[PDB]
Amino acid sequence: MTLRAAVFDLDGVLALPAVFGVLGRTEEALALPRGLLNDAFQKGGPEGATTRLMKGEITLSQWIPLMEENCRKCSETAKVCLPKNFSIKEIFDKAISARKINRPMLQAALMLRKKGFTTAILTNTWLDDRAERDGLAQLMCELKMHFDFLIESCQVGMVKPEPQIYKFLLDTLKASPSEVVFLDDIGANLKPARDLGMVTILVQDTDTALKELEKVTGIQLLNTPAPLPTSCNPSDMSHGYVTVKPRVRLHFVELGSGPAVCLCHGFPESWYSWRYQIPALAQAGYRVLAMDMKGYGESSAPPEIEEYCMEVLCKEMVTFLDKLGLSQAVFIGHDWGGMLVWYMALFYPERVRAVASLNTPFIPANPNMSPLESIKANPVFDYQLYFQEPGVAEAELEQNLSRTFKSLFRASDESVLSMHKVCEAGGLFVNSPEEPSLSRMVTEEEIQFYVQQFKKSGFRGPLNWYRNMERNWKWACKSLGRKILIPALMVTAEKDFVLVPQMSQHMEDWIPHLKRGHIEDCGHWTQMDKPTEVNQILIKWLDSDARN
């Protein structure tokens, strides 16, 4: 009554198992005198080597010998001999990579931050200059995105339980002592907090710690449902810009290091449709290049229809790689991005490390029949005839941008359109609501981002993708001799009623080594409908097929 901020210790609170645990275990393993190693660590007290380390006076690699000094003469006071193969670097290396994020604590912090809490990490830690310091660096990267502040002892020159660092914390949070909970696995670090008037929590096991936190904050933290993957705030993203042609510039969002993964969105979407998988895939060891496909967002949207036929579209993606200096990327696509992705594989497989499509099956061209005839045969594609005459489909979709996306971006059990007889009634929205309810898949804010984006170039660019049926037919017919023998994945969505899974049923004919994925209760808008299981599928397939 009333907290506003949450401060989490790192070792033994946000990250487990703690590194003090690898003191005690090593001793028992080596049958060393109880303590010894822990006595060497704490040797010297406030003026000891470990306190200098934690204040950033010296680096971890400077400390290793100083720590061994302490283990040499702690063992000489008890007249004990160190073991033949002792390496305090080796012990501490293992402890550090063994340490991993305590997931239920990290969720608990997100939850509190979702509800208006100012969260921060307060940790005694070190300037890590070891050969394998990249391990911890990643751990710290993943963590810090989720907190307003990361206060490390070696960066600020102050260390727990010194009262001064707590005053720093308060000053940094811009909050009074009784407005902040501080959780830590050490009694001594809580006393100074309590003295300023802070609520503290002695963290032993994680579950009991949350109960306390839960109780004192009055917000459900334990047992809450599995939360969504990390989303992307556009202004934190790295934005990239490549001109591939006189008046064609492609825009993309970049995040991660590793093999290039190029995400190609569908109709009527944007790079932001991959908001749930950009961070995930980065995290999985990949360099995500999430595209604004030509016609959309901050990519160019030149008026000409011809500019959006698959061939020119594909060539431009090649030029995009060329200018970025990439010999390959693994292309992953959805809806129209899917179609295009498959064609990159068939026409430029030297540039495609691997290929993957959500929802969109690879269907080869029918060399006898023209596709404009085939699409009249199947009434679920009746909306595509409507999209043919330039200007008509634009007027409606632009009439009210908000209404348009709210109406489109819905789960399969939230349908608000009649699918067929679209030319019949003359409009996609004819008998649809002006102010539709907000779908469970998308917040108000996420919609308005799409709204923002389509205010630049509208729907002429996007719709033109449907206006090169004949031209793409002729092109694809050149590939009818070919097959796909590079790694390929097909993810089907049970309840995509327009890109039905049955359409993919013959795909192993032209792609014999095709791997598959399937999602129950999944509409057309796969990525925001089932982001958790999409990432799970894609990462697994990336790690197994797209690298090693």
129 is a catalytic site residue: no
Alpha-carbon span 41 to 51, nearest angstrom: 9
Q: Is 476 in the site for ligand FVS (CB under 6 A)?
A: yes
Q: Are 320 and 242 in contact (CB under 8 A)?
A: yes
Q: Is 224 flagged in the annotation as binding?
A: no
Query: Taking the CB of residue 326, how many other CB atoms lie within 10 A of it?
Result: 17
Rounded to whole angstroms, the Cα distance separating 440 from 353 reads 35
Q: Is there a cis peptide before residue 161, judged by omega within 30 degrees of 0?
A: yes
Q: Which is nearer to ligand FVS, 256 or 268 (CB)?
A: 268
Answer for which of 5, 8, 9, 393 binds Mg ion (CB under 5 A) is 9
In the shown chain, the binding pattern of residues 157 to 196 toward Mg ion, with x for contact by CB under 5 A and - for none, equals ----------------------------x-----------
DSSP 315-332: HHHHHHHHHHT-S-EEEE
- Of 5-13, 72-80, 251-259, 334-342, the window that binds ligand FVS (rule: CB under 6 A) is 334-342
Q: Using CB under 6 A, which of 38, 59, 366, 418 touches ligand FVS?
A: 366
- Closest residue to ligand FVS, based on beta-carbon distance: 472
- Could you give the angle at which helices 21-29 and 88-98 cross, rounded to 10 degrees? 130
Cβ atoms of residues 207 and 215 within 8 Å: no
Known catalytic residue at 466: yes
Q: Does 9 carry a binding-site annotation?
A: yes
Determine contact, residues 353/260, Cβ cutoff 8 Å.
yes
11 binds Mg ion (CB under 5 A): yes
Tell me the sheet residues that pair with 101: 15
Site string for a copy of itself, 484-523 (x = CB under 8 A): xxx-------------------------------------
Query: Which residue stretches of 19-102 are H helix?
Result: 21-29, 37-41, 49-54, 60-77, 88-98
State the catalytic residue, choosing from 292, 335, 496, 529. Answer: 335
In angstroms, the CA 113 to CA 489 distance is: 37
Q: Which residues pair with 330 in a beta bridge?
A: 261
Q: Helix or strand or coil: residue 516?
A: strand
Compute the radius of gyration of the chain from its Cα atoms: 29
Nearer to a copy of itself (CB atom), residue 310 or residue 422: 310
Contact flag: residue 363 with ligand FVS (CB under 6 A) = yes
308 catalytically annotated: no
In the set 184, 276, 524, 545, the catalytic residue is 524
- Residue 161, SS3 per DSSP: coil
Q: Among 203-211, 269-277, 325-333, 535-543, which window interacts with a copy of itself (CB under 8 A)?
A: 325-333
CB 382 within 8 A of CB 397: no
- The answer to whether 312 contacts ligand FVS (rule: CB under 6 A) is no
Closest CA to 66 of 35, 88, 81, 85: 88
Compute the least distance from the CB of residue 284 to Mg ion, in Å.
28
Q: Which is nearer to ligand FVS, 41 or 473 (CB)?
A: 473
Distance in Å, CB of 483 to a copy of itself, minimum: 6
Angle at 45 between CA 43 and CA 48, to 5 degrees: 65
Task: Kindly list the residues in this chain that would bind a copy of itself in the complex (CB under 8 A).
Answer: 52, 56-59, 61-62, 127-129, 133-134, 136-138, 140-141, 144-145, 155, 157, 235-243, 254-257, 259-260, 282, 287-288, 322-328, 347, 349-351, 353, 478, 481-486
Task: Kindly list the residues in this chain that would bind ligand FVS in the complex (CB under 6 A).
Answer: 267, 310, 335-336, 339, 360, 363, 365-366, 371, 374-375, 383, 408, 428, 469, 472-473, 476, 498-499, 524
Which of the residues are catalytic? 335, 466, 524
What are the binding residues for Mg(2+)? Answer: 9, 11, 185
